[PDB]
Design a binder for this molecule. Structure first.
Ligand code: HEM
Ligand code: HEM
Ligand code: KLA
Ligand code: KLA
Ligand code: H4B
Ligand code: H4B
Ligand code: ZN
Lengths: 407, 411
């Protein structure tokens, strides 16, 4: 019931006690592990609020104090009266940083405390959402010296007035089905691109067309906005040794910014909460460029390298994969856009994990997501046992809005 | 109940009903997932249900469920348990059980081959010398001059747990490791402790970088005995690179036959504490883990030097670059010497086909994603995108404590 995790490369063992605060369910049971599955009233609210407020006032060394008891009473009053309640700015900031701290699938959590929280709970229209998101983008991009940030829109009330960003990320490229049968652009985004065209977007039908924002305020129908082109920092991808690489026409955007998750704090739900940091190189070069269901350029790069593509055992896919990922890091570094390589990021996560066990009693971590999608065992996270459990505050998945929105 | 798994690359959705037949526990709870934890005397009381379950499975597979032969066998095993507190498997049941233990091995990517396992029955063995002879014949048969063949040798089952047969080696063929006084290691750092045991037991160590360890063999609970595998039975492959002629000068070689010898085979409640089994290598087991783990031979630095890669910052991906070239050399060398080996692309594509086949005809295929995904180039292999369900069926291979921690010494 108190748990050990071993690192099999260094022989270090850590003792996890933080998991005994787990509040949500994992999807696993004693008979079956689901660790690789991508997606496994007033009475409910006050215990949720009490538990968050208890950890908040414990974190500020004011547990059981007058201010603690007074807030507890005031929140209790507000829930009986107004069915819900509002977070103080300090609680909102704490709740947001801790949601990131608790994100077991995130390798970049060594940075969790330096998050810039933008309170957008005064937003009332989709036009306001767009201004708040443009400012987020500009602040976070910061001319390429990227800064972590989240923008928090008004909390769910009765579920019929949700704020939602319909895009999965603030910045993504469109995908179009060709009459051909092939796919132009990002195949991950074909459906959402269809909804943009359905809502009236004029698609350039290019290969790297930054999608528009589809913003929903107060449960209203979503509206379309285009991020100002000069706020979208992009990087042309070249290779430090292959002059021909630039001829592939590849570029990627600088800012990874997740916009479709749900932030839970003290039982309150923030259905629109875009957050951003900076890329790990392999997110672009391994997944975006080489997934079969994405831009899928492995074959092309390998042909320009003149590799023996007859047999898998020449490892031509592996060789091209390394080169694509060399180019991605070289291009971002050359253009002075913040990026981290998977060796640096995983080494940082180990230091962070040690810090969390030492100062917090544990660190929930999902090995399937923490280990990078290339060169797994030469990063130190590969040899690190990890316990996965669900702490709150938390980022959570939510249904795509077009499947739930009454139009 | 029905459970579904999605492949996120192809959108194939499969439905698992086989998990309903799972008895053993996983280590996970509704509140914690232990999916990345490495490792998370039996009275007549529980033995007969375990026998009855295995025998029902066996007679179902041969389409004889409920037959007179089935009912007689159950009656026979029942009486043998109440009389003798244990029972003996027929040869057919032992073969079936060992194949299915492999079939159920959720961490094994090679399971497409599970039905082509050569089972060597060594249940008549009584001494360590006899174990040695059986193991030599396994190595010779399985090596097959480089045309490798899967095999398992099964020694007598546990009785009171005071007379266990055990192979003390973790693998039949492994290289020694020697801790130097200066802290460095010569040979395989993984095997330092076992090497010391061998030396303590009287092994005269050559003290080179690639010394094949002796077998340390325990029969009927007696103290273990040292035996040197005949070197002509130990097929080895010198590692060279198809384009880099300096690679041969690194002096690397590996053995051809991977053979796990420290696991326990459970069949119908019987425990076979000595059951070495062997197949052939996936390239990355040698080129990624054995050569490039920091806790193993750890040659990335040297190889990257010889390629004169920019090593001053990890952002050059020099580690990734040298990793691919080492794994190219390992596959090139085994293929050149006509020793069986599979690359991780071929191996994972085959496992996907096997798993889909298993879903259709068996209703499930337990799989441990953490172990199935190769240790390099994970997402350009089709298992990366494949959701998997991990659960424990019997017959099964289980871990067991190392014998030097449990063995009662005689002297
Ligand atoms: C600052 C640099 C950051 C880096 C290098 C980083 C890295 C990553 C990576 C590699 C993943 C795996 C996701 C995938 O492969 O698709 C991930 C997931 C995630 N990150 Fe971080 N991240 C950063 C910042 C942040 C921030 C600022 C937040 C929230 C405030 C955050 C929250 C999350 C969450 C919730 C997930 C899991 C998403 C899911 O389950 O789909 N990350 N991160
Ligand atoms: C025929 C070719 C085979 C291939 C290519 C293969 C491949 C693999 C690989 C790559 C692993 C992970 C090993 C590690 O990372 O340490 C593994 C594990 C395993 N294999 Fe296979 N294997 C083969 C044959 C067999 C056979 C014949 C058996 C048993 C009869 C078997 C049973 C297992 C088991 C039980 C594990 C789990 C080991 C553990 O939990 O530590 N495999 N296999
Ligand atoms: C802030 C941030 C920083 C960073 N450095 N990186 C990311 C990307 C993390 C991420 C989060 C998600 F919520 C979803 C994705 C991609 C969704 C796909 C859908 C597939 F099914 C598998 N994942 C990526 C975000
Ligand atoms: C039959 C077979 C074929 C193949 N192609 N490959 C293997 C390797 C499987 C294996 C199982 C083990 F039980 C242990 C190892 C190596 C020991 C390390 C040390 C740690 F304990 C973790 N495993 C390898 C086996
Ligand atoms: C901690 C972690 O489970 C450990 O490093 C595992 C990860 N996956 C693995 N996968 C394979 N095939 N072999 C291994 O030894 C391991 N080690
Ligand atoms: C099936 C499997 O869960 C799926 O491919 C996961 C594996 N690990 C991952 N890891 C990260 N970081 N991101 C991902 O999208 C995935 N996808
Ligand atoms: Zn689990």
């Amino acid at each position: 019931r108190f748990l050990k995790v071993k690192n099999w490369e260094t022989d270090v063992v850590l003792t996890d006690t933080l998991h005994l605060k787990s509040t949500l369910e994992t999807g696993c049971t004693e008979h079956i592990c689901m660790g690789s599955i991508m997606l496994p009233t007033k009475d409910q609210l006050f215990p949720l609020a009490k538990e968050f407020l208890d950890q908040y006032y414990s974190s500020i060394k004011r547990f059981g104090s007058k201010a603690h008891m007074d807030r507890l009473e005031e929140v209790n009053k507000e829930i009986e009266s107004t069915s819900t309640y509002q977070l103080k700015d300090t609680e909102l900031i704490y709740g947001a940083k801790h949601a990131w701290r608790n994100a077991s699938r995130c390798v970049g959590r060594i940075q969790w405390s330096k998050l810039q929280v933008f309170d957008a709970r005064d937003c009332t229209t989709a036009h306001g959402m767009f201004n708040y998101i443009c400012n987020h983008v500009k602040y976070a991009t910061n001319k390429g010296n990227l800064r972590s940030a989240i923008t928090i829109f008004p909390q769910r009330t009765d579920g019929k007035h949700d704020f939602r960003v319909w895009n999965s990320q603030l910045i993504r490229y469109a995908g179009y089905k060709q009459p051909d049968g092939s796919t132009l652009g990002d195949p991950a985004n074909v459906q959402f691109t269809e909804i943009c065209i359905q809502q009236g977007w004029k698609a350039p039908r290019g290969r790297f067309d930054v999608l528009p924002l589809l913003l929903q305020a107060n449960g209203n129908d979503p509206e379309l906005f285009q991020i100002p082109p000069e706020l979208v920092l992009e990087v042309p991808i070249r290779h430090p040794k292959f002059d021909w690489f630039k001829d592939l026409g590849l570029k990627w955007y600088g800012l990874p910014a997740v916009s479709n998750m749900l932030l839970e704090i003290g039982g309150l739900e923030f259905s629109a909460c875009p957050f951003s940091g900076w890329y790990m190189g392999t997110e672009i070069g391994v997944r975006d460029y080489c997934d079969n269901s994405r831009y899928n350029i492995l074959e092309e790069v390998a042909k320009k390298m003149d590799l023996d593509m007859r047999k898998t055992s020449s490892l031509w896919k592996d060789q091209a994969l390394v080169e694509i990922n060399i180019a991605v890091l070289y291009s971002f570094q050359s253009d002075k856009v913040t990026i981290v390589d998977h060796h640096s990021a995983t080494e940082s996560f180990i230091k962070h994990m040690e810090n969390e066990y030492r100062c917090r009693g544990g660190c929930p971590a999902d090995w399937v997501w923490i280990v990078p999608p290339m060169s797994g065992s030469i990063t130190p996270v590969f040899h690190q046992e990890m316990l996965n459990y669900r702490l709150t505050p938390s980022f959570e998945y939510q249904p795509d809005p077009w499947n739930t929105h009454v139009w």
